[PDB]
Amino acid sequence: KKPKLLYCSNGGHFLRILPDGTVDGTRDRSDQHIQLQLSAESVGEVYIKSTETGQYLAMDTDGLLYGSQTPNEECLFLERLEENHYNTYISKKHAEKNWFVGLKKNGSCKRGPRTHYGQKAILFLPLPV
Numbered sequence: 001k002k003p004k005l006l007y008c009s010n011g012g013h014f015l016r017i018l019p020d021g022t023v024d025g026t027r028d029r030s031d032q033h034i035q036l037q038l039s040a041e042s043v044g045e046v047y048i049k050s051t052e053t054g055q056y057l058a059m060d061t062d063g064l065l066y067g068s069q070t071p072n073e074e075c076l077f078l079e080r081l082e083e084n085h086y087n088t089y090i091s092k093k094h095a096e097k098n099w100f101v102g103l104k105k106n107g108s109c110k111r112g113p114r115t116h117y118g119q120k121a122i123l124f125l126p127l128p129v
């Protein structure tokens with residue numbers, strides 16, 4: 001199945017998990033760190049995996065995204081279809097806090113606390129390769 005790219009509406013960045021372990025966006029679609037494999041725990045719960053490094057997308061306990069080496073609870077995201085047909089990805093562990101995966105206009109991480117419903121920052125188009 002897949003992989004996909006996640007294209008953010010905000011500045012038109014593909015979500016990227018760098019070998020650093022840092023997360024950001026790049027506009028370069030032939031970047032090798034933007035190819036992402038999504039898998040499902042339960043219905044509407046995904047892990048998001050870099051296929052180049054095998055890292056998982058994760059959000060830490062204060063709202064910053066990082067690449068994780070293992071699929072732990074900080075790696076579960078709620079994928080929710082929005083209008084239409086972008087998805088948003090809410091941190092499952094901090095779901096009560098409305099912490100989304102987000103990129104800023106310049107393609108760097110938005111911090112979970114700085115996110116909220118209705119921002120372009122949180123909208124991602126999954127493009128199956």
Ligand SMILES: CO[C@@H]1O[C@@H](C(=O)O)[C@@H](O[C@H]2O[C@H](CO)[C@@H](O)[C@H](OS(=O)(=O)O)[C@H]2NS(=O)(=O)O)[C@H](O)[C@H]1OS(=O)(=O)O
Nearest residue numbers: 010011102103104105106107110114115118119120121122
């Ligand atoms: C269309 O949507 C957005 O609005 C733009 C804007 O507000 O001029 C732009 O916002 C970025 O800059 C503004 C001020 O210049 C910041 O207030 C905003 O950050 S904040 O979200 O922390 O409050 C910032 N958004 S960011 O790039 O996501 O950090 C931006 O293109 C759009 O922001 S949105 O919230 O995703 O809708």
